[PDB]
């Protein structure tokens, strides 16, 4: 069977360099076409040759290894880089993150409903997690006891820092009698925050 396996990914700063490796087995290495394709939400699937100087493919003198040397990297080069022997054989993909951010803890803000009093049958609360790096953060409600009616939204890059939010919806006769708390944890900064959601008051 054919096996391709990438390595050498991770974090790197803008203008920096990184060399990816891909070890191959199950065929005669020099008889095979070996290439690199990257995937991002913005650009989709791209052959490294489409990005063009900055991305150069080479091979090991003896071993079954193909390399991808990446230079002068930019934030837009962030994505998953696949080793491939076209068309059927692909590695697992390795994540390359290009960013100048230092490790930064999230600011966690509770989002209670409008002060006026939206009331109605149901009530929706929120929890805003802003300005953290790197990914990921884990967000739960009431130690994970409240899972129904929850929408945690994927993080987006805002400036050079990540921001995400989460909504939770419950019947109007629960909150604020039943306490509701979003629990946010960020392993990289060693921070675990619990923010209770409380009704707004006049300024």
């Amino acid at each position: 069977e054919v096996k391709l396996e990438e390595s050498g990914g991770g974090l790197v700063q803008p203008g920096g360099s990184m060399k990816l490796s891909c070890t191959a087995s199950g065929f005669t290495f020099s008889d095979a076409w070996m290439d690199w394709v990257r995937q991002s939400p913005e650009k989709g699937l791209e052959w490294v040759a489409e990005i063009r100087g900055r991305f150069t493919i080479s091979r090991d003198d003896s071993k079954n290894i193909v390399y991808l040397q990446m230079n002068s990297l930019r934030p837009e080069d962030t994505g998953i880089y696949y080793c491939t022997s076209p068309f059927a054989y692909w590695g697992q993909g390795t994540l390359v993150t290009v960013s100048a951010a230092k490790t930064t803890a999230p600011s966690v803000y509770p989002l209670a409903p409008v002060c006026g009093g939206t009331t109605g049958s149901s009530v929706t609360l929120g929890c805003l997690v802003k300005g953290y790096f790197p990914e990921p953060v884990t967000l739960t409600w009431n130690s994970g006891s409240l899972s129904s009616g929850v929408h945690t939204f994927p993080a987006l890059l805002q400036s050079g820092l990540y921001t995400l939010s989460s909504s939770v919806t419950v019947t109007s006769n629960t909150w604020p009698s039943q306490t509701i708390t979003c629990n946010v944890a960020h392993p990289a900064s060693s921070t675990k925050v619990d923010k209770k959601i409380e009704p707004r008051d006049p300024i």
Binding site: W47, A49, Y82, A88, Q92, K130, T163, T169
Partner: protein
């Protein structure tokens, strides 16, 4: 380089139906077309090559057709395990460019979004920031438009919209829209509005607040 266009980014299907995914090449490529299937967290997987030649192990429900510039991947009797992104690719000219992708989704009855708006928290205002958040939850179909207004005028910059994946239980979508402002900007203007336009209503759904009110 040759441009491969898949006009549909999302398609909704019912299990048992037939679906046709289109691919268009910017140049004549004969029948040098490959189709891939990609599930989340996995590499693309080869389905068809030479436009219509099915790869080993692929169910015969998958059929590729077309020649020249217009190609079609047809999935007959669609099953739940066919939910995935589908990509076309040409190999008449290197780089062997990929299409933009088409995700298969579940069809359901139309459902209006539940909209709720949230002014900046007290604690954020003390830290010197001001974000206005709008949740639009549990709607179908996916197509939706959100407009932010400040004292009646539309506001375009500083807006980030984040979609959830389709829900595995009720097949709906949810969206988060965040208007980021400076504190001094938030404290100058009065009215803040979140307007949602969706096919379930002729009129847009409007949620708003005034900064000084309660």
């Amino acid at each position: 380089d040759i441009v491969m266009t898949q006009s549909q980014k999302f398609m909704s299907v019912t299990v048992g139906d037939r679906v046709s995914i289109t691919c268009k090449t910017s140049q004549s490529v004969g029948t040098t077309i490959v189709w891939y299937q990609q599930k989340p967290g996995q590499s693309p997987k080869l389905l068809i090559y030479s436009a219509s030649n099915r790869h080993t192990g692929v169910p015969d429900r998958f059929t590729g057709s077309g020649s020249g510039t217009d190609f079609i991947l047809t999935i007959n009797n669609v099953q739940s395990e066919d939910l995935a992104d589908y990509f076309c690719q040409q190999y008449t000219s290197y780089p062997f460019t990929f299409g933009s992708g088409t995700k298969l989704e579940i069809k359901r009855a139309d459902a209006a979004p539940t909209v709720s708006i949230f002014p900046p928290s007290s604690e954020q205002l003390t830290s010197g920031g001001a974000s206005v958040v709008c949740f639009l939850n549990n709607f179908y179909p996916k197509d939706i438009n959100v407009k932010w207004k400040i004292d009646g005028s539309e506001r375009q910059n500083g807006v980030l919209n984040s979609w959830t994946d389709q829900d595995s239980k009720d097949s709906t979508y949810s969206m988060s829209s965040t208007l980021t402002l400076t504190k001094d900007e938030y404290e100058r203007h009065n009215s803040y509005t979140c307007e949602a336009t969706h096919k379930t209503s002729t009129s847009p759904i409007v949620k708003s607040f005034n900064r000084n009110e309660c």
